[PDB]
Amino acid sequence: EAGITGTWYNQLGSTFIVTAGADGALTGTYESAVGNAESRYVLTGRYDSAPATDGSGTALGWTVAWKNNYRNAHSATTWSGQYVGGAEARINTQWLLTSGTTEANAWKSTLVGHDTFTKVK
């Protein structure tokens, strides 16, 4: 059991639902606490499907481009992190958010931050 498939929450009011395939694929959706369709976006990613057995976390990453049928922010976020299992399972990530810019504004195109996701809201 990879423990990754299911619904995950951050503390800022966001939810994502992911399926972890046997081949290393991550597929799902990223949405708001609200759950309205205008706030739901496609996500795709990859994870290590044969992690080490010594207590290390499971490395993974995924991308959301912030376009759906209703809105387009001309940007994309990537999260890079690891899953840590157990009774208090969590995904610890750092992320990069890049917006489309002109070349003169490219120096300010990319934000960086961190997010932790848990199975309980």
Please report, as residue ranges, which positions from 96 to 115 form the binding site for its own copies (by CB under 8 A): 96-103, 106-114
By CB under 8 A, tell whether 24 contacts its own copies: yes
Q: Is the dihedral of CA 3, 39, 68, 114 positive or negative?
A: negative
Instruction: Tell whether 66 is in a known binding site.
Output: no
Among 15, 31, 40, 58, contact with its own copies (rule: CB under 8 A): 58
* Distance in angstroms (rounded) separating the CA atoms of residues 65 and 18: 16
Instruction: Tell whether 79 is in a known binding site.
Output: yes
CB of 86 to its own copies, least distance (A): 9
Q: Per-residue b/e over 36-63, b at no fewer than 16 CB within 10 Å?
A: eeebbbebebbbeeebeeeeebbebbbb
By CB under 8 A, tell whether 50 contacts its own copies: yes
Which residues participate in the annotated binding site for biotin? Answer: 30, 41, 79, 95, 107
